[PDB]
From Swiss-Prot, chains A, B:
The protein's name in its UniProt record: Inositol 1,4,5-trisphosphate-gated calcium channel ITPR1
Locations listed in the record: Endoplasmic reticulum membrane; Cytoplasmic vesicle, Secretory vesicle membrane; Cytoplasm, Perinuclear region
Family per record: Belongs to the InsP3 receptor family.
Record function comment: Inositol 1,4,5-trisphosphate-gated calcium channel that, upon inositol 1,4,5-trisphosphate binding, mediates calcium release from the endoplasmic reticulum (ER). Undergoes conformational changes upon ligand binding, suggesting structural flexibility that allows the channel to switch from a closed state, capable of interacting with its ligands such as 1,4,5-trisphosphate and calcium, to an open state, capable of transferring calcium ions across the ER membrane. Cytoplasmic calcium released from the ER triggers apoptosis by the activation of CAMK2 complex.
Gene: Itpr1
Post-translational note: Polyubiquitinated. Polyubiquitination targets ITPR1 for proteasomal degradation. Approximately 40% of the ITPR1-associated ubiquitin is monoubiquitin, and polyubiquitins are both 'Lys-48'- and 'Lys-63'-linked. Phosphorylation by cAMP kinase (PKA) enhances calcium release. Phosphorylation by PKA increases the interaction with inositol 1,4,5-trisphosphate and decreases the interaction with AHCYL1.
Subunit structure: Homotetramer. Homodimer. Interacts with ERP44 in a pH-, redox state- and calcium-dependent manner which results in the inhibition the calcium channel activity. The strength of this interaction inversely correlates with calcium concentration. Part of cGMP kinase signaling complex at least composed of ACTA2/alpha-actin, CNN1/calponin H1, PLN/phospholamban, PRKG1 and ITPR1. Interacts with IRAG1. Interacts with CABP1 (via N-terminus). Interacts with TESPA1.
Length: 87, 87
C-alpha cells in the first residue's frame, strides 16, 4: 500500500542514500515568480513576427507578378504603339 | 478627527500588532528606478507588432481575392480563347 512518494523514499532508504532531504531550498522562497515567463512570451512573439516573413512574402510576390505583367503591358503601350503609326 | 493613515495606525495599535514599522526598507534606496518599465514598453510593443497580424492579414486577403479573380480571368485568356478559333 505504498503511495507514490512514499515508495520512492522507501527505496532511497534501502539504497542508503540521503539525497531526498531538502538542502538550502524552501518552497516559500521559491514561490516568487519574479515576473518570469516574460522571456518565453518575448521569444514566441519574436518568432511570430519572424513568421511574418512568410505572411508578407506571399503578399509581396502575389503583388509583384501582377505588377510586372502590368508593367509588361505598359511596355507594350510604348513598343507596340511605336510601330503602329504609318509613314 | 483621525486622518487617513493615523486612524489605521490607531487600529493597528489596538490590535497589538507591530507590522506597520518599516523593516529593512527605506524610501531613499527604493528611489532608484533602474531604467524600469522598459519591460512593460517591450511587452506592449511586442503585442503591437503581434497586432500587425490582423493589420496585415486584411491587406493580404483583400489583395489575394483580387489576385485570384484576375488569375481566373487570365485562365480564361487561355481556355476561352483556345476554343474560339475555328477549324
Ligand atoms: Ca498503490
Ligand atoms: Ca476625516
Amino acid at each position: 500500500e505504498y503511495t507514490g512518494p512514499e515508495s520512492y523514499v522507501a527505496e532511497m532508504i534501502r539504497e542508503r542514500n540521503l539525497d531526498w532531504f531538502p538542502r538550502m531550498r524552501a518552497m516559500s522562497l521559491v514561490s516568487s515568480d519574479s515576473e518570469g515567463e516574460q522571456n518565453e512570451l518575448r521569444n514566441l512573439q519574436e518568432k511570430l513576427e519572424s513568421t511574418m516573413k512568410l505572411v508578407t512574402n506571399l503578399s509581396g510576390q502575389l503583388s509583384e507578378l501582377k505588377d510586372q505583367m502590368t508593367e509588361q503591358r505598359k511596355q507594350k503601350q510604348r513598343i507596340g504603339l511605336l510601330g503602329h503609326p504609318p509613314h
